[PDB]
Design an enzyme around this catalytic site. Structure first.
Site, short mmCIF file in Angstrom:
data_model
loop_
_atom_site.label_atom_id
_atom_site.label_comp_id
_atom_site.label_asym_id
_atom_site.label_seq_id
_atom_site.Cartn_x
_atom_site.Cartn_y
_atom_site.Cartn_z
N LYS A 37 0.99 -1.19 -0.03
CA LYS A 37 -0.18 -0.03 0.02
C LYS A 37 1.10 1.27 -0.01
O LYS A 37 0.57 2.25 -0.76
CB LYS A 37 -0.96 0.18 1.15
N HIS A 65 3.82 4.24 5.98
CA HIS A 65 3.12 5.46 5.76
C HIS A 65 4.27 6.32 5.79
O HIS A 65 5.25 6.38 6.20
CB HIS A 65 2.37 5.89 7.34
N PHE A 66 3.75 7.54 5.04
CA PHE A 66 4.60 8.67 4.52
C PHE A 66 3.98 9.90 5.45
O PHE A 66 2.94 10.06 5.67
CB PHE A 66 4.43 9.24 3.16
N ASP A 67 4.91 10.07 6.40
CA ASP A 67 4.41 11.29 7.55
C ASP A 67 4.63 12.71 7.48
O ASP A 67 3.93 13.33 7.78
CB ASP A 67 5.11 10.75 8.82
N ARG A 106 -1.50 18.32 -3.44
CA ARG A 106 -2.48 18.84 -2.26
C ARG A 106 -3.59 19.30 -3.12
O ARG A 106 -3.64 19.89 -4.04
CB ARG A 106 -1.64 20.06 -1.65
N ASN A 158 -0.66 14.00 -0.68
CA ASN A 158 -0.15 12.94 -0.63
C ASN A 158 1.32 13.17 -1.45
O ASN A 158 1.35 14.11 -2.44
CB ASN A 158 -0.77 11.92 -1.63
N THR A 159 2.14 12.46 -1.12
CA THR A 159 3.47 12.56 -1.48
C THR A 159 3.98 11.66 -2.33
O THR A 159 4.03 10.16 -1.96
CB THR A 159 4.68 12.95 -0.25
N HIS A 201 2.85 5.87 -2.68
CA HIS A 201 4.29 6.63 -2.76
C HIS A 201 5.36 6.59 -3.56
O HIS A 201 6.18 7.33 -3.60
CB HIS A 201 4.51 6.94 -0.89
N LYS A 234 -7.97 11.87 -1.86
CA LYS A 234 -6.88 12.23 -0.83
C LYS A 234 -6.37 13.35 -0.63
O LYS A 234 -6.04 13.99 -1.72
CB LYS A 234 -5.95 11.06 -1.06
#
Ligand SMILES: [Au+]
EC number: 4.6.1.18
Length: 124
Positions: free
Chosen positions: A7, A119-121, A85, A44-45, A12, A41
């Site tokens: 995921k 996850h991307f924080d 964004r 997201n990066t 990402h 969403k």
């Protein structure tokens, strides 16, 4: 069936040098990675580095995550990324994004055995 690690890859990873697209990268990628399927969403990066280089971050600088967990890691080197964004005019299902290209230190949450990004924080 989709693992947390897969995921993170889907959400990402975009191993390339930097963003390439025929049109607005974020609008194309957010749609193509299924990040506009159930809602837009909102942020997201995407990371334009090899998977191995992203994975290695799980062994780099231990930092608190935004949610207060302690299993986040910051990359020692800057990485090529693209930040997507949602715009103000964006309204699901017509999601729309602003594309910001950047070279920043990433922060990822790592989990699992193997210990991998899930996850991307933040980027700093
Ligand atoms: Au730095």
């Amino acid at each position: 069936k989709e693992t947390a690690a897969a995921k993170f890859e889907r959400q990402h990873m975009d191993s390339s040098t930097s963003a390439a697209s025929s049109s607005n990268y974020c609008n194309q990628m957010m749609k193509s990675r299924n990040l506009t399927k159930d809602r837009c969403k909102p942020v997201n990066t995407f990371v334009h580095e090899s998977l191995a280089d992203v994975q290695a971050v799980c062994s780099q600088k231990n930092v608190a995550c935004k949610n207060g967990q302690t299993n986040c890691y910051q990359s020692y080197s800057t990485m090529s990324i693209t930040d997507c964004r949602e715009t103000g005019s964006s309204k699901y299902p017509n999601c729309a994004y602003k594309t910001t290209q950047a070279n920043k230190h990433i922060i990822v949450a790592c989990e699992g055995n193997p210990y991998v990004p899930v996850h991307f924080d933040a980027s700093v």
